[PDB]
């Protein structure tokens, strides 16, 4: 029988057969009191103690969230939708342990993305059994509250203070500290990693003093807090709180009556109004996300970064080749996943209106001018690819590069990567390229499974990335082997070297998309 | 089998070597691990252990950056560490003839690696052949490299400089207090080393605290007066502060700088070592020996001219093509994968990379002196000139100058010029007889006939092996009847012995016309 004694009680797991070995899995451990009833919109309350044995043998409920139904039946969009029932009672975590039990294993803690409005740790692409099996690491992941239930903010009011989903994540890290030894893991060797809004969350744990003792190192995939979508100003968030009140007939004279009113709405009545709190949004709108709450964040994060007030540790950062393409088929004119989306100069100008709704006509012209110095005038694909790059540079690449620059300037080793391989099984069309989110399956080792019809090159790439990630967690250095391997050098703000990841050649290069990023850092803010 | 050292018992291993047996002790600890509060400090003497230490595997190599310019390539990876890296690395190895001798001369090897890399467990430093064929006891030790071994704030015991030099000194101390228990003679000990190991050896000649720890010295392709060998206290101060800024460790206080640096991950020290110098070259020594006021009481060249050093017999030499290895770590037009033919303009660009602070006039004068072609048709003329510039300035001419001055104090000195290119050499033919590729002949590797060496290579390696062990035992590098006698190097005739498979001649005034530039004109540009 598979039983571990946690400080809240005993849990029962399951045995999994992975590559002729075993992985012990405990799926669905609770780490907090369910945020029901009067605990709606409050920080997670710590768990008590049960006397039974909790049966951690299935994934648990996913937190309440709207679903993406833009392409019914499409594996492309549906692989991100929740694969367990939805409920407000969702504060559960999973643990994958290598067999035979380790004695001081390094722990990798995954934090999913989803614009802070969607996501769940139970998705097939976040399956930590391969990492446990192949690299002997413990893998942990948690469900955290998304949308208004996760990030509604009346700043300074404990009834709805903001950043609750981030405190959710933080509590799960507290659990790993208190309990992971009992499973064989070293609480002094804990590496957070996440993707997109999960990576933005990981960068915010670097800034937040209450997290500093809960992990060792950070891995940020396709996101950072200084991305234009990741943080809301303190008073833009309280404004959206009040318009959600109005949208459900909860406008009141004092804030705590507002909250008491919101607490008796049914989740669906809240999720049904979340889109409407922003006047005019883009496909990258975060309706309810991290804010300056005075608690988890004591200042706008760009200030803390500049002043050097953050955890001093090693980081691993990178981005994908085609971050922007996914968002074009969610609101730009002339774009479909089912045709090759050749657009015109004026469709391109309408695209920019979709993604830059508040920008002047001169600013939209300067973006267009910077992105139309074609190598070949036709190339019908010019304007289609230009728009993908505008979205991808402004929203993911240039901020990740800026964060790594500023962070490395205070003396810790930083490593940067450019992921360039398109998955051979990728359900989206070819013109969308190396999309946002489609390195995750390679980070978790899914191509190591041969019955799954990936290419042998893809198994070798995924085997490499798994090794480099797990070595970075263990040693602070994303090396593969000492010989017959390209050295991944540290990213310093002068040379700015990064490693490229694909099947043909891993190369050291420098100054990734510097001529694009110079626009967003040095011209666009002045517009 | 087991031996009792003054601090506990160690257990060894049997090696079967050329029909006989060699008894090996690999990975004996000789100092406390320089960890935690001991990082950057001198080595702390060890205290007795009650168990039995098992010196049966090579130990951890000291933290160091790894040459990964050529992933897969044997010619560079054979210098990379072949045990795990760790700050816990002050171990040494001992190889003993079988059956046990009772008063064997000891040969102590100090490896090179520009003071930044290296380890005693490399295959080309395997001491079992020397013990088997000549009945000498061979020792080698790991010492700290890079900033972890040579970070200097002069006068502060928390980071004084030369810590890696004192590592070597503590290992020499262990041999004085323990080699007799193994069957060795502490009164017959010869240091030998290559490149930075050779420079290390020559500094042990100058440092009075090492005076009593050895008898004689062998210096392969290096000496302390080489331009890359010693950092000024000025340079060391600029580089320690630069490492502080690069790690986030700038403080207003020296001791706060070091308390911050003791908290850094070793990789955060290693991976910043490269940026502490603005104008680096492929021969840059980021953190090397300094005048610390302890190991070195004064500037080495002063101690040399005044005669303030251990008086004894020394054996010194260089290889024919010392410079070529460095040409593929920076110079333009050079590759291990093509014949590296270059033009006069590319030659001028190589000079820029090797001499970044030299005036345009001085770089012109380097050019002129090295372009008096015997045959001005050969397209490889400039390729050869540049390797000869680097080799003469950095290794050959400093070694000749060192041997001249050392000899003028009544000491018997012997100089050699090694010209054999190994038949197995992984690097292209144009690099010739490279830096570091006499070592495998000195350690007896070609004596193993299941190894793709040539017959001539076995015979050449057997005489070098014999001559070296003879210099250790008797103070004179003699050999067998049919064997050229090796005459003493003296300032006026300047005789040296040539080493190759064809014929070993006696010649005079090695490369005198090249070196006249580096001693008598270059110092004035
Ligand atoms: C003594 O150190 C200073 C500081 O130098 C920089 O070197 C960088 C590569 C990097 O490692 C960084 O940590 C450090 O700041 C040297 O100063 C510089 O000199 C060059 C001229 O060659 C100028 O171009 C730089 O602007 C200047 N930088 C600063 C900050 O002053 C200086 O050269 C060095 N001197 C010696 C003799 O080593
Ligand atoms: C061991 O290593 C090479 C691969 O080294 C390439 O591996 C990359 C991950 C990267 O680190 C890079 O620096 C390194 O050079 C092995 O090579 C490859 O071998 C497979 C078959 O096993 C071929 O299908 C590939 O085309 C080939 N890629 C190359 C050569 O770039 C190789 O087997 C081995 N090399 C040696 C010298 O032992
Ligand atoms: C990757 O590089 C790291 C260096 O950062 C290697 O780390 C040492 O690893 C061993 C385990 O084999 C430890 O016992 C040492 O203490 C580590 N030392 C340091 C300074 O980190 C690691 O072994 C390398 N891994 C591979 C597969 O090459
Ligand atoms: C697991 O590994 C840790 C180190 O990461 C061990 O902790 C030791 O080192 C700590 C450094 O942070 C110090 O607190 C102590 O020297 C030591 N901690 C102790 C003895 O509790 C930890 O012991 C390991 N646990 C094992 C091997 O079971
Ligand atoms: O809460 S979200 O609305 N999630 C819904 C998304 C809409 C964008 C496409 N997909 C995800 C996706 C991923 C890959 C490939 C196909 C589809 C569904 C949201 C909102 C802002 C973000 C801002 C940044 C990143 C993610 C964000 C997610
Ligand atoms: O240890 S190093 O830091 N590494 C750079 C070297 C460049 C020389 C080629 N190799 C080693 C090598 C050896 C032989 C033949 C092929 C290759 C790697 C270093 C740094 C300064 C030096 C200065 C002087 C001498 C040696 C030095 C070594
Ligand atoms: C805050 O937001 C206000 C938005 O008002 C709106 O009405 C609500 C109900 C929603 O449906 C939104 O779509 C509407 O835009 C702004 O009117 C106000 O100026 C903002 N700022 C401040 C400082 O109040
Ligand atoms: C959890 O399940 C318990 C039953 O264990 C069951 O019996 C054991 C031996 C295994 O076979 C297991 O797979 C079976 O499901 C119940 O007795 C217990 O009440 C359950 N606990 C809770 C909290 O529901
Ligand atoms: C779990 O796996 C272990 C080790 O592989 C095995 O000994 C045991 O029988 C399994 N227990 C189950 C399936 O309950
Ligand atoms: C040393 O190795 C021997 C090999 O025979 C082993 O028996 C012994 O347990 C080891 N002792 C140690 C590590 O103290
Ligand atoms: C060798 O060892 C003996 C051991 O008694 C010692 O007396 C002698 O001085 C040593 N020296 C030499 C040069 O052999
Ligand atoms: C160095 O500065 C620290 C800062 O408080 C101080 O405690 C220490 O005594 C200082 N030491 C010297 C020698 O100035
Ligand atoms: C040798 O190779 C290097 C790098 O590949 C190149 O720059 C150089 O021009 C080549 N030289 C010749 C003669 O082919
Ligand atoms: C000698 O060469 C052969 C192939 O040519 C190789 O297999 C063998 O291992 C080599 N010898 C040694 C000692 O490596
Ligand atoms: C493809 O996408 C939509 C299909 O509804 C359409 O508006 C767009 O113009 C189409 N483009 C083509 C077919 O090139
Ligand atoms: C070396 O090893 C054995 C094993 O202990 C030792 O007794 C003997 O002196 C040597 N001889 C052989 C054949 O190993
Ligand atoms: C060389 O070794 C010693 C030292 O001079 C001497 O006794 C011996 O006879 C010499 N042998 C030859 C062959 O020169
Ligand atoms: Cl996502
Ligand atoms: Cl060397």
Cβ contact B68–A485 (<8 Å): yes
**Residues 6+ positions from A321 with CB-CB distance below 8 Å:** A418, A419, A420, A433, A434
Structural domain count, chain B: 1
Task: List A191's β-bridge partners, or say none.
Answer: A108, A217
Query: Long-range contacts made by residues B510-514, C-beta under 8 angstroms, separation at least 24?
Result: B510/B396, B510/B400, B510/B415, B510/B417, B511/B392, B511/B396, B511/B397, B511/B400, B514/B369, B514/B370, B514/B388, B514/B392, B514/B396, B514/B397
Q: Which domain holds residue B229?
A: 1-525
Q: Is B114 annotated as a binding residue?
A: yes
Task: Round to whole Å and give the CA distance between A402 and A220.
Answer: 13
Task: List A53's β-bridge partners, or say none.
Answer: A10
Task: Round to whole Å and give the CA distance between A323 and A2.
Answer: 42
What is the sign of the dihedral through the CA atoms of B389, B390, B391 and B395? Answer: positive
* 3-class DSSP state of A174: helix
A312, A485, A490 ranked by CB distance to B71: nearest: A485
B72, B268, B275 ranked by CB distance to A412: nearest: B268
Q: What is the 3-state secondary structure (H, E, C) of A451-492?
A: HHCCCHHHHHHHHHHHHHHHHHHHHCCCCCCCCCCCCCCCCC
Cβ contact A412–B275 (<8 Å): no
Q: Is B12 annotated as a binding residue?
A: no
What is the sign of the dihedral through the CA atoms of B232, B234, B235 and B239? Answer: positive
Contact residues, chain A, for B275 at CB < 8 Å: 492
Rounded to 5°, the CA angle B30-B36-B39 comes to 65
Within A36-89, strands assigned E span 53-55
Atom from ligand 7 closest to the CA of residue A240: 2
Chain B interface includes A117 (CB < 8 A) = no
Cβ contact B271–A490 (<8 Å): yes
Q: What is the 3-state secondary structure (H, E, C) of B380-448?
A: CHHHHHHHHHHHHHHHHHHHHHHHHHHHCCCCCEEEEEECCCCCCCCCCHHHCCECCCCHHHHCCHHHC
Chain B interface includes A505 (CB < 8 A) = no
Phi, psi of A196 (to 5 degrees): 65, -125
Among protein residues, the one whose CA lies closest to atom 14 of ligand 13: B338
| Residue whose C-alpha is closest to residue B42's, from B147, B170, B142, B135 | B170
Cβ contact A413–B275 (<8 Å): no
Task: Round to whole Å and give the CA distance between B433 and B325.
Answer: 10
Distance between Cα B357 and ligand 1 center (Å): 14
Distance between Cα B367 and ligand 12 center (Å): 53
Cis peptide before A100 (omega within 30 of 0): yes
Tell me the ligand closest to A347's alpha carbon: 15
Task: Round to whole Å and give the CA distance between B422 and B428.
Answer: 11
- Could you give the residue numbers annotated as active site of A? 196, 323, 436
Contact residues, chain A, for B80 at CB < 8 Å: 482-483
Task: Round to whole Å and give the CA distance between B19 and B197.
Answer: 32
Q: Are A171 and A32 in contact (CB under 8 A)?
A: yes
Distance between Cα A116 and ligand 15 center (Å): 30
Task: Round to whole Å and give the CA distance between B44 and B90.
Answer: 10
Write out the two tokens for A313. 């540790």
Chain A interface includes B275 (CB < 8 A) = yes
Task: Round to whole Å and give the CA distance between A62 and A94.
Answer: 13
Cβ contact A484–B71 (<8 Å): yes
Chain B interface includes A477 (CB < 8 A) = yes
Chain B interface includes A502 (CB < 8 A) = no
Chain A interface includes B349 (CB < 8 A) = no
Identify the residue whose tokens are 């490299």. B145
Q: Are B460 and B447 in contact (CB under 8 A)?
A: no
| Residue whose C-alpha is closest to residue A123's, from A167, A89, A78 | A78
Q: Which residues sit with their C-beta closer than 6 Å to ligand 11?
A: B 103, 185, 187-188
Task: Round to whole Å and give the CA distance between A500 and B262.
Answer: 33
Resolution to one decimal, Å: 2.7
Task: Round to whole Å and give the CA distance between B249 and B244.
Answer: 4
Chain A interface includes B267 (CB < 8 A) = yes
Contact residues, chain B, for A484 at CB < 8 Å: 71-72
Cβ contact B265–A490 (<8 Å): no
Q: Are A262 and A41 in contact (CB under 8 A)?
A: yes
Write the CATH number for A85.
3.40.50.1820
Cβ contact B77–A411 (<8 Å): no
Pairing of strands A497-501, A414-419: parallel
Distance between Cα B74 and ligand 13 center (Å): 21
* 3-class DSSP state of A8: coil
| Residue whose C-alpha is closest to residue A359's, from A521, A235, A526 | A526
* 3-class DSSP state of B158: coil
Residue B79 CA: distances (Å) to CA of A68, B88, B433 = 56, 20, 17
Distance between Cα B237 and ligand 12 center (Å): 19
* 3-class DSSP state of B222: coil
CB-ligand 13 contact for B335 (6 Å cutoff): yes
Count of CB pairs separated by less than 8 Å, A with B: 41
Residue A421 CA: distances (Å) to CA of A321, A455, B129 = 8, 12, 51
Task: Round to whole Å and give the CA distance between A337 and B203.
Answer: 72
Alpha helices (H) along B37-141 = 74-77, 128-134
Tell me the best of A70, A329, A331, A339 to mutate to test the pocket of ligand 15, counting ligand atoms within 8 Å of each CB and taking the most.
Answer: A339
Pairing of strands B52-54, B137-141: unpaired
Structural biology method used: X-ray
| Gyration radius (Cα) of chain B, Å | 22
Residue B17 CA: distances (Å) to CA of A117, B54, B451 = 70, 21, 14
What is the sign of the dihedral through the CA atoms of B225, B226, B228 and B229? Answer: negative
| Residue whose C-alpha is closest to residue A402's, from A321, A332, A333, A493 | A493
CB-ligand 1 contact for B11 (6 Å cutoff): no
Task: Round to whole Å and give the CA distance between B304 and B405.
Answer: 7
* 3-class DSSP state of B310: coil
**Residues 6+ positions from A340 with CB-CB distance below 8 Å:** A384, A429, A431
């Amino acid at each position: 029988d598979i039983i571990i004694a946690t400080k809240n009680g005993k849990v029962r797991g399951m045995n999994l057969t992975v590559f002729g070995g075993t992985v012990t899995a405990f799926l669905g451990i609770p780490y907090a009191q369910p945020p029901l009833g009067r605990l709606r919109f409050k920080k997670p309350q710590s768990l008590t103690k049960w006397s039974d044995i909790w049966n951690a043998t299935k994934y648990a409920n996913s937190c309440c969230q709207n679903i993406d139904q833009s392409f019914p039946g499409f594996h492309g969009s549906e692989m991100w939708n929740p694969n367990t029932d939805l409920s407000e009672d969702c504060l559960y975590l999973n643990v994958w342990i290598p067999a035979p039990k380790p004695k001081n294993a390094t722990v990798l803690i995954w934090i999913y993305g989803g614009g802070f409005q969607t996501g769940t740790s139970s998705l097939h692409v976040y399956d930590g059994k391969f990492l446990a099996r192949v690299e002997r690491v413990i893998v942990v992941s948690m469900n955290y509250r998304v949308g208004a239930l996760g990030f509604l903010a009346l700043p300074g009011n404990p009834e709805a203070p903001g950043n609750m989903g981030l405190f959710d994540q933080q509590l799960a890290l507290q659990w790993v500290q208190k309990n992971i030894a009992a499973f064989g893991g070293n609480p002094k060797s804990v590496t957070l990693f996440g993707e997109s809004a999960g990576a933005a969350s990981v960068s915010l744990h670097l800034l937040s003093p209450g997290s500093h003792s809960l992990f060792t190192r950070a891995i940020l995939q396709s996101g950072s807090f200084n991305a234009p979508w990741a943080v809301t100003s303190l008073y833009e968030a309280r404004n959206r709180t009040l318009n959600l009140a109005k949208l459900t007939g909860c406008s009141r004279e004092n804030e705590t009556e507002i909250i008491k009113c919101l607490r008796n709405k049914d989740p669906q009545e809240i999720l049904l109004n979340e889109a409407f709190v922003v006047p005019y949004g883009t496909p990258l709108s975060v309706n309810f996300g991290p804010t300056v709450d005075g608690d988890f964040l004591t200042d706008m994060p760009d200030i803390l970064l500049e002043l050097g007030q953050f955890k001093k540790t090693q980081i691993l950062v990178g981005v994908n080749k085609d971050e922007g393409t996914a968002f074009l088929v969610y609101g730009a004119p002339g774009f479909s996943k089912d045709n090759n989306s050749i657009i015109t100069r004026k469709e391109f100008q309408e695209g920019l209106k979709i993604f830059f709704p508040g920008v002047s006509e001169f600013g939209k012209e300067s973006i267009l001018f910077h992105y139309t110095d074609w190598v070949d005038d036709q190339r019908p694909e010019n304007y289609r690819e230009a728009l993908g790059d505008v979205v991808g540079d402004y929203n993911f690449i240039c901020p990740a590069l800026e964060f790594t620059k500023k962070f490395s300037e205070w003396g810790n080793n930083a490593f940067f990567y450019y992921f360039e391989h398109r998955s051979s099984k990728l359900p989206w069309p070819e013109w969308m390229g190396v999309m946002h989110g489609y390195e995750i399956e390679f980070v978790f080792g899914l191509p190591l499974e041969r019955r799954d019809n990936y290419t042998k090159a893809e198994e070798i790439l995924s085997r490499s990335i798994v090794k480099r990630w797990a070595n970075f967690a263990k040693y602070g250095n994303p090396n593969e082997t000492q010989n017959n391997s390209t050295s991944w050098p540290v990213f310093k703000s002068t040379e700015q070297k990064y490693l490229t990841l694909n099947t043909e050649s891993t190369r050291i290069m420098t100054k990734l998309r510097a001529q694009q990023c110079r626009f967003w850092t040095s011209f666009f803010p002045k517009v």
